[PDB]
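RETRY 2/3 - previous attempt timed out on the joint model. Re-submitting the same 299-residue input unchanged.
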Amino acid sequence: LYDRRSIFDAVAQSNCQELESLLPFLQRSKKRLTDSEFKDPETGKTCLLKAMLNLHNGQNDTIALLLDVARKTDSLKQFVNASYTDSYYKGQTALHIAIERRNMTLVTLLVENGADVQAAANGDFFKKTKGRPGFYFGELPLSLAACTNQ
Amino acid sequence: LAIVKFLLQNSWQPADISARDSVGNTVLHALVEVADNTVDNTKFVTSMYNEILILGAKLHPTLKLEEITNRKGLTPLALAASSGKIGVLAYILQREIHEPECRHLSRKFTEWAYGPVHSSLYDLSCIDTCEKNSVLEVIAYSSSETPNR
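RETRY 2/3 succeeded.
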């Protein structure tokens, strides 16, 4: 069995083992990696997104496994494309983060598993400082990738 | 530096890192006293200071070194500010160190960043030190019978 907490901890330390029994779990319960219960109820963060924050050397293969699991249930598209819902990071997707981190490899990977390239990150974190701040590029992956000189 | 290390680390008699001289000054106080506001002066005092703290936290973690008052009631910081040793004052308030046992020592931390963006967090002892003096308060008065202050 797996609750939200269980996976998020596994992800935090790049553990691909504690997620050995993962796929077969939501096969029995037919639960989806995308269920309401597998996201933070106030931000909309998913395990993939936790993984995106918990990088070590711009690397995490909990990602590769996490994606793999989502296709086997074909949560695939809406999984890779889930966005933040809090006023701060609203509309931020994993692809936004990969770029923010200047990580070709993870941009490449996300685009190949079908990240929406037109997804607008539009929360207060992506507009001019309250100061909050900060910082605006606006919104769309291309725009980001240019404004950060990439 | 090497001899600072050998004094504190040797087998025969390790130096008491918190001892006070006749005036109440510790090594951190003395360093503040030895500053003369020249760029290379700041630079050497600043990191020897750093070094002492790193050694304090490594060797004797319980010791809150920067809180120790000289005879006149002054922490190293407050001395720095009483004697217009500005580069060092700025150094002591500014510095944040990330290491195991790092957090206790560090003045300030940066909570978060965005691809653009940065945030800086300050402790801040000078503002909150109502009881004896506030970095501002010594600074705040401020008679400034000197250009440098």
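The helical segments of chain B are 2-9, 27-34, 39-59, 76-82, 86-94, 102-105, 125-128, 135-140. Closing ticket.
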